[PDB]
Design an enzyme around this catalytic site. Sequence first.
Site, PDB file in Angstrom:
ATOM      1  N   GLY A 137       0.799  -1.227  -0.157  1.00  0.00           N
ATOM      2  CA  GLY A 137       0.090   0.165  -0.225  1.00  0.00           C
ATOM      3  C   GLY A 137       0.742   1.205  -0.067  1.00  0.00           C
ATOM      4  N   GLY A 138       0.386   2.290   0.745  1.00  0.00           N
ATOM      5  CA  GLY A 138       1.018   3.636   0.880  1.00  0.00           C
ATOM      6  C   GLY A 138       0.760   4.475  -0.535  1.00  0.00           C
ATOM      7  CG  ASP A 190       1.574  -7.568  -4.927  1.00  0.00           C
ATOM      8  OD1 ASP A 190       2.547  -6.529  -5.285  1.00  0.00           O
ATOM      9  OD2 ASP A 190       1.876  -8.420  -4.361  1.00  0.00           O
ATOM     10  NE  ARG A 250       5.335  -7.825  -0.161  1.00  0.00           N
ATOM     11  CZ  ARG A 250       5.635  -8.762  -0.987  1.00  0.00           C
ATOM     12  NH1 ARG A 250       5.035  -8.922  -2.140  1.00  0.00           N
ATOM     13  NH2 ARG A 250       6.636  -9.392  -0.449  1.00  0.00           N
ATOM     14  CG  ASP A 256       3.151 -12.177 -14.191  1.00  0.00           C
ATOM     15  OD1 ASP A 256       3.630 -11.541 -13.545  1.00  0.00           O
ATOM     16  OD2 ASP A 256       3.668 -12.474 -15.305  1.00  0.00           O
ATOM     17  N   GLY A 257       1.594  -8.965 -13.666  1.00  0.00           N
ATOM     18  CA  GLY A 257       1.607  -7.555 -14.540  1.00  0.00           C
ATOM     19  C   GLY A 257       2.348  -7.659 -15.682  1.00  0.00           C
ATOM     20  CB  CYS A 262      12.455   1.286  -3.339  1.00  0.00           C
ATOM     21  SG  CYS A 262      13.327  -0.076  -3.470  1.00  0.00           S
TER      22      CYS A 262
HETATM   23  C1  LIG Z   1       8.788  -2.833  -4.045  1.00  0.00           C
HETATM   24  S1  LIG Z   1       7.244  -3.498  -3.809  1.00  0.00           S
HETATM   25  C2  LIG Z   1       6.166  -2.041  -4.525  1.00  0.00           C
HETATM   26  C3  LIG Z   1       5.898  -1.255  -3.408  1.00  0.00           C
HETATM   27  C4  LIG Z   1       4.745  -0.457  -2.788  1.00  0.00           C
HETATM   28  N1  LIG Z   1       4.126   0.038  -4.024  1.00  0.00           N
HETATM   29  C5  LIG Z   1       4.903   0.342  -1.909  1.00  0.00           C
HETATM   30  O1  LIG Z   1       4.948   1.603  -1.975  1.00  0.00           O
HETATM   31  O2  LIG Z   1       4.705   0.065  -0.575  1.00  0.00           O
HETATM   32  C6  LIG Z   1       6.965  -4.313  -5.701  1.00  0.00           C
HETATM   33  C7  LIG Z   1       5.961  -5.471  -5.657  1.00  0.00           C
HETATM   34  O3  LIG Z   1       5.553  -5.924  -6.945  1.00  0.00           O
HETATM   35  C8  LIG Z   1       5.310  -7.333  -6.912  1.00  0.00           C
HETATM   36  N2  LIG Z   1       5.666  -7.876  -8.016  1.00  0.00           N
HETATM   37  C9  LIG Z   1       6.857  -8.545  -8.372  1.00  0.00           C
HETATM   38  N3  LIG Z   1       6.925  -9.047  -9.468  1.00  0.00           N
HETATM   39  C10 LIG Z   1       5.756  -8.665 -10.218  1.00  0.00           C
HETATM   40  C11 LIG Z   1       4.920  -8.752 -11.423  1.00  0.00           C
HETATM   41  N4  LIG Z   1       5.425  -9.809 -12.290  1.00  0.00           N
HETATM   42  N5  LIG Z   1       3.585  -8.668 -11.581  1.00  0.00           N
HETATM   43  C12 LIG Z   1       3.116  -7.893 -10.471  1.00  0.00           C
HETATM   44  N6  LIG Z   1       3.483  -7.781  -9.238  1.00  0.00           N
HETATM   45  C13 LIG Z   1       5.030  -7.861  -9.200  1.00  0.00           C
HETATM   46  C14 LIG Z   1       6.296  -7.825  -5.574  1.00  0.00           C
HETATM   47  O4  LIG Z   1       5.671  -8.886  -5.339  1.00  0.00           O
HETATM   48  C15 LIG Z   1       5.960  -6.491  -4.667  1.00  0.00           C
HETATM   49  O5  LIG Z   1       4.885  -6.669  -3.805  1.00  0.00           O
END
Ligand SMILES: C[S@@+](CC[C@H](N)C(=O)[O-])C[C@H]1O[C@@H](n2cnc3c(N)ncnc32)[C@H](O)[C@@H]1O
Lengths: 95, 335, 238, 85
Positions: free
Chosen positions: B136-137, B155, B160, B188-189, B261
């Site tokens: 979130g956030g 996600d 998560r 999947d994104g 990040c």
């Molecule tokens: C760095 S976190 C995002 C941070 C979040 N938006 C925040 O500000 O708190 C990246 C997220 O993307 C997810 N993710 C990784 N590969 C992905 C994919 N192929 N499709 C969708 N989500 C994916 C990870 O599991 C993780 O929860």
Amino acid sequence: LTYFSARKGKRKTVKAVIDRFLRLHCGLWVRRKAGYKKKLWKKTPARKKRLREFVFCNKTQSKLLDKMTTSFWKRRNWYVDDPYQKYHDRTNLKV
Amino acid sequence: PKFPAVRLALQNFDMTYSVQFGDLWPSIRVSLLSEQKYGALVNNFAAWDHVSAKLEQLSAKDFVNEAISHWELWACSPNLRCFTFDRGDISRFPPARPGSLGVMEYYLMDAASLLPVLALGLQPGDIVLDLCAAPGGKTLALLQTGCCRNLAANDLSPSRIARLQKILHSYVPEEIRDGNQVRVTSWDGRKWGELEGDTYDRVLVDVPCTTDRHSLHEEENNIFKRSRKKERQILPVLQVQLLAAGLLATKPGGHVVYSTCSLSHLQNEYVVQGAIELLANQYSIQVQVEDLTHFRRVFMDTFCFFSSCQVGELVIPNLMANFGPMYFCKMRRLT
Amino acid sequence: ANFVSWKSRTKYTITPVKMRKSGGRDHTGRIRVHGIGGGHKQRYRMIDFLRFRPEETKSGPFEEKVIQVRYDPCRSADIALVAGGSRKRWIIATENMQAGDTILNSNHIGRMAVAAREGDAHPLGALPVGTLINNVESEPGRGAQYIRAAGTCGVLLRKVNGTAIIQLPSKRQMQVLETCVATVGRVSNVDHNKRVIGKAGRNRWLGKRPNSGRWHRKGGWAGRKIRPLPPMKSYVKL
Amino acid sequence: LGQIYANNDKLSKRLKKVWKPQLFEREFYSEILDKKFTVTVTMRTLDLIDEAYGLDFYILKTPKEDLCSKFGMDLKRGMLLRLAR
RNA sequence: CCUCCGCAUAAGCCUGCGUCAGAUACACUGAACUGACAAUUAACAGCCCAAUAUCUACAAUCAACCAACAAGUCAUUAUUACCCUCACUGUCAACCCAACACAGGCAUGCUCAUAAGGAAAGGUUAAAAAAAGUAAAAGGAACUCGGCAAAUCUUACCCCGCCUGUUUACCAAAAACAUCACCUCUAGCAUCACCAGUAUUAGAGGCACCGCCUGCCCAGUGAUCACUUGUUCCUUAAAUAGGGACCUGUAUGAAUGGCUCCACGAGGGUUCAGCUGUCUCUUACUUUUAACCAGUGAAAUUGACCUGCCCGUGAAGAGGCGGGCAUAACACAGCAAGACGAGAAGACCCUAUGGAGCUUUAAUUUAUUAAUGCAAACACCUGCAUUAAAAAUUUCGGUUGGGGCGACCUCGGAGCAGAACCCAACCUCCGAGCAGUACAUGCUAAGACUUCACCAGUCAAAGCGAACACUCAAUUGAUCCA
RNA sequence: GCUAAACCUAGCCCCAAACCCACUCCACCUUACUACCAAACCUUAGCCAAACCAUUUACCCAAAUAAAGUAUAGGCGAUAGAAAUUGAAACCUGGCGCAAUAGAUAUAGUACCGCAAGGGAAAGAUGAAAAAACCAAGCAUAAUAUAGCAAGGACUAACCCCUAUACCUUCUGCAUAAUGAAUUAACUAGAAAUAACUUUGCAAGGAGAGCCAAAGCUAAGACCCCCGAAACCAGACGAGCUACCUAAGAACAGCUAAAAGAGCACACCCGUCUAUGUAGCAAAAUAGUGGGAAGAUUUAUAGGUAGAGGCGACAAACCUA
Ligand SMILES: C[S@@+](CC[C@H](N)C(=O)[O-])C[C@H]1O[C@@H](n2cnc3c(N)ncnc32)[C@H](O)[C@@H]1O
Ligand SMILES: [Mg+2]
Ligand SMILES: [Mg+2]
Ligand SMILES: [Mg+2]
Ligand SMILES: [Mg+2]
Ligand SMILES: [Mg+2]
Ligand SMILES: [Mg+2]
Ligand SMILES: [Mg+2]
Ligand SMILES: [Mg+2]
Ligand SMILES: [Mg+2]
Ligand SMILES: [Mg+2]
Ligand SMILES: [Mg+2]
Ligand SMILES: [Mg+2]
Ligand SMILES: [Mg+2]
Ligand SMILES: [Mg+2]
Ligand SMILES: [Mg+2]
Ligand SMILES: [Mg+2]
Ligand SMILES: [Mg+2]
Ligand SMILES: [Mg+2]
Ligand SMILES: [Mg+2]
Ligand SMILES: [Mg+2]
Ligand SMILES: [Mg+2]
Ligand SMILES: [Mg+2]
Ligand SMILES: [Mg+2]
Ligand SMILES: [Mg+2]
Ligand SMILES: [Mg+2]
Ligand SMILES: [Mg+2]
Ligand SMILES: [Mg+2]
Ligand SMILES: [Mg+2]
Ligand SMILES: [Mg+2]
Ligand SMILES: [Mg+2]
Ligand SMILES: [Mg+2]
Ligand SMILES: [Mg+2]
Ligand SMILES: [Mg+2]
Ligand SMILES: [Mg+2]
Ligand SMILES: [Mg+2]
Ligand SMILES: [Mg+2]
Ligand SMILES: [Mg+2]
Ligand SMILES: [Mg+2]
Ligand SMILES: [Mg+2]
Ligand SMILES: [Mg+2]
Ligand SMILES: [Mg+2]
Ligand SMILES: [Mg+2]
Ligand SMILES: [Mg+2]
Ligand SMILES: [Mg+2]
Ligand SMILES: [Mg+2]
Ligand SMILES: [Mg+2]
Ligand SMILES: [Mg+2]
Ligand SMILES: [Mg+2]
Ligand SMILES: [Mg+2]
Ligand SMILES: [Mg+2]
């Protein structure tokens, strides 16, 4: 268990069984459900009712408990005010 | 553990970030290991007026309000309020509580995390995508604006995304989270392009990063674990795919923001450059990177920026203003 | 066990006394001290460490003549046979002591500090400040225990009120009553430390058995780890 | 001579333990024997003497099983013989 | 013909080749076997000594020069007391410790080859293989892991360790250990070790001669001295920053590392020259063994065997099973292809809720020791507590080649039993260890289901009391005990 | 027909009863069995059980029985376990014990083995009088004749013909694989309860006090093996080998050497390399060749250090193969 005592040369009762089980004279053994005092907050009322029960044991369980107790625990007792007095004898049982 | 995972992160960062930042690295290094400064993002669905007054009593100032004033000396996302302490103040906000309405007053989160949201020039009645919303956030801040006609939260990990549901329930009322008003998905994104193309006015892409702040502190499920070494190697490839996928979903004339990040130029600049190249060849779609020089200038008071980035803006942590690293690049799909 | 100490003599004599080697063993028969055993046979010469010992039916300061200065197997220092009246005794010889030398032993504390000749033994009260001294006593009339190794000299640092500070050869100060007697000068056999054993065989003659072949990790222990500090140990380079 | 549990819990280790009395050399006067004796005593016996109103009374009153001393019995015999003769 | 043995003493043993008479691990009808009889004679050796004080500085080495160091193996006197003598015991042998009449072990004197002590061949023959020797044409390491062995008696090096020395008795003699020298740590002292010693000493250790290099976290600039700084106090609500004192009797740093080098070594490697049957390529002879004759006479081993070959079968592998073939029966001498040939002892992997040794930052302890504090007692002792040293007891789950880095162990879903139930180990993927809404999420009770047992788990009519037995795939934990 | 076989009685076992022993003379705690001179009291531990182990885990204590395996105790697990109370009959010289591999180890604590503590055997058979038949294995009488788990079906006929893959035990299953057996004789391995069943007695009662009982109670019958570790602890015995030490001793030819933990080299000590030997001469030797051989040398005698230990020029060496 102790089949023959060193002092008396007698079979001994396992005191664990006495602490946990009731013997009805007819041969049945009564027990509490396991975990009936445990984590009642996360349990359904139906489940809680099921736990708050006095339940009979298997034939195999009864046979085990019989062997683990002496004849004293199997005698007919005429307690003055016994809540389980009526349950001591079986009625209308066919085989 | 026989060898801490957090130690690998230090070893990894030292060899690469020292050459990247030079004399700036020591300053960044000490800030990363020190305690993170937090900003309170006031929930608009709660009593915004009452909370603002309460936080003002704690000698906290709304930086974004000041930012809007100096903006006109496109427009940033409205209806966002984040209070942060003055430079050199280590003061912590009290833990948030539920409100009278039954929703929490404010959300404690990294102030730098709001910058990608602010960079995305949200307008009322805009269909918006967040490819990586959980936990979130950022996605919460999308809803706070109230300019989202339809919001999609995605996600890969349902673990998560479950945490997001908890955040959404606590902060956003059920009325706002109606049918297809806020959509939550665990798919999947990468395969989002073929799912729906030319759908969204605005897409926020927050790819998985090395999580520099998080990797140094938290041992559990560290990316720098030797078991996860294969994930790190394929991460630059994976990041490009996600950014490309977001671009496909965007309508022509629409804007995306790429948020990372990490300090690494590999996961920041090359990913953006790579995504444009990939899209221009494979799908024959042109992307124009929008300059954020004006954006960096406005937010100099609260956040220090690393002025050497070819594309996007990188927020570096300083011991004065210990805000977690945030690289945001805004770009528009011409075709 | 069956062990009986050879140190049975009750009467002082200048005759060399047959002594029994211990081997570093006890009365029990087990080893207490390692690296001792089986050198050249030795005979013990009883030493009178009480320099101011007036003869029977005699009192006050007395003089003695040095008969000979002789090697002693039992100690590093040379010994001197000294005769006075009708008594001969063994004492510890000074650096410059020859046959024919006359040495004085006094119990007289002088108001004016007497001139300190090398051979003579005086109370510390009599002796001037800064004089090199040897064969000191901790207590009055106890006997010399402190500076009696070869080429060793103590320094009388200061004299306060019936008390005297002396410097033992280890540079440690010691408080002593002024009435205690010390011998002036340095002990004989200077450059004893400068001697070269030369071969393993010589130490065997001196009765020193070779050191254990076992390898020890360190003479000193490892520093005990406090509760928060353990992560700071066993860092591996990469 | 007994055993103890390590930290007054039966689940901890059982150890051999010896409790010894505190001993004192004290001088005592017997008026029956008109003699002073130096004896090793405890505080218990001193309290016993006090309550008996003197060493002689303590020795004469106290039986053999309570005294638990050969010397005590010899003292008793001495005093009894003095009184008898 | 041999003598590397002998004679004696010591130690050990105890009548154990003297006489007579008998039966009878080669044998004499004789033996050292049986029984009886006899014998070792003290001068040699052993077995010693009245008391109390007291005396005893100066080696030995031909003891004289000379030279020492490790400093040494032998002495009385004064006074009192004192008069009886040759007792007792060992004295033999061809011998002891090794289960034996055992090629072994065994101190000293004399003999240094004998004046003393012994016999390698039971008889024969002259096979093979085996053992020890001798001689060998031409060649001279071509042999071989390696000049091992033999012959010949040899140079120049390299590595390692300074050297002499020590070590796994019974597979390792070395590069390991020790070692002079050097270095570190600890200790200011008497009557049982250290030591009848005392800091040039003693103990605990490291390294390894010597020789040559390698040495500052002692406060900084500026001209021994001023001044911020460092350290402590106070003011200050308390601080910031101000007021005062000190750092000026001295400091050295490495149980640090490298470098050649002389001598030495049954150390490991290389090499010159010679040399030799190591080899090309083997031969001849002698001795042992052998085989035969005579005597005495074991051991491992052995289910029973009237115990063949080829091909096939038996997951390989057959004397014995199938199809072929072969085949009078018996010794003796060779051989080692087979009888998974025989005896132990191995090495490898795995297992045991089997051991043990060692280590520790494994768990449980501090009974012991030492110190400290508090009681008691007026320093010691005792009780309690704390801290260390020294130990003590016990253990080291399961899956994953085996090892390192990892992963996994419980619950729910899919591939996955195409259609009642159950069932796909291992693997390939996913998820769960919550949360939200009620607050009758009260009470009670027919009948049922059930994760193949049990324990758990699930559904529920009617009734009492209310109102007009929640959603979600999992979202979880027995007993004891508190 | 040899070797052999066969035997009955020395003695022993369990009880009962009864409270045992103890100087011819001489010698005997010193090196025992040698005529004769200046100091004892002091918690057992551990194996084992708990399927590991760490608290814990029956062990005589004043005489039957019953209360009662009850109260209690206990990682409340394994298991341990009372008392108040009741109440006790008294005739020794017997045996549904063994009979020489049994019963004692015993013909004897001997011979023998071990330094010691300690371990520890085997065996005899006439008759009233000795002053009187046949049978185990192995063999021999009497070696053998194509061919094969040794036999079976047979046959006139031993063999020839036809048929037939030894026994036991183990591995999830398989034998033909692997384990065990030379053969004979003797010896050598299923012990008890609750509850049930069967057969009697009596029966709402049964039982020769206690205990059980809504047909039960009483009695009887009928089910639970043998051998084997490495270990752990307690108390003794060991330094005559060896490691080190102590006391007082002994040995070291000859030659070169300014002279020595020097060199060559005997005796002596050790054991480098090869060969022999491998149930041997030998549970570590022999022959040759080697290292040292005035010394940190070798060696005789007596003494010391002892296992939670000693001792060690550390080899985890040595402490009676
Ligand atoms: C760095 S976190 C995002 C941070 C979040 N938006 C925040 O500000 O708190 C990246 C997220 O993307 C997810 N993710 C990784 N590969 C992905 C994919 N192929 N499709 C969708 N989500 C994916 C990870 O599991 C993780 O929860
Ligand atoms: Mg000395
Ligand atoms: Mg060493
Ligand atoms: Mg005879
Ligand atoms: Mg004589
Ligand atoms: Mg002769
Ligand atoms: Mg012969
Ligand atoms: Mg012959
Ligand atoms: Mg031949
Ligand atoms: Mg030739
Ligand atoms: Mg060659
Ligand atoms: Mg050559
Ligand atoms: Mg070749
Ligand atoms: Mg050779
Ligand atoms: Mg030749
Ligand atoms: Mg060497
Ligand atoms: Mg030498
Ligand atoms: Mg040598
Ligand atoms: Mg040796
Ligand atoms: Mg060896
Ligand atoms: Mg060897
Ligand atoms: Mg070394
Ligand atoms: Mg060598
Ligand atoms: Mg033959
Ligand atoms: Mg013959
Ligand atoms: Mg045999
Ligand atoms: Mg075949
Ligand atoms: Mg066949
Ligand atoms: Mg043959
Ligand atoms: Mg066969
Ligand atoms: Mg075990
Ligand atoms: Mg065990
Ligand atoms: Mg079921
Ligand atoms: Mg299953
Ligand atoms: Mg209902
Ligand atoms: Mg157990
Ligand atoms: Mg018998
Ligand atoms: Mg017997
Ligand atoms: Mg027969
Ligand atoms: Mg046939
Ligand atoms: Mg067999
Ligand atoms: Mg001894
Ligand atoms: Mg000895
Ligand atoms: Mg000696
Ligand atoms: Mg000589
Ligand atoms: Mg020499
Ligand atoms: Mg030599
Ligand atoms: Mg040695
Ligand atoms: Mg070693
Ligand atoms: Mg080793
Ligand atoms: Mg042994």
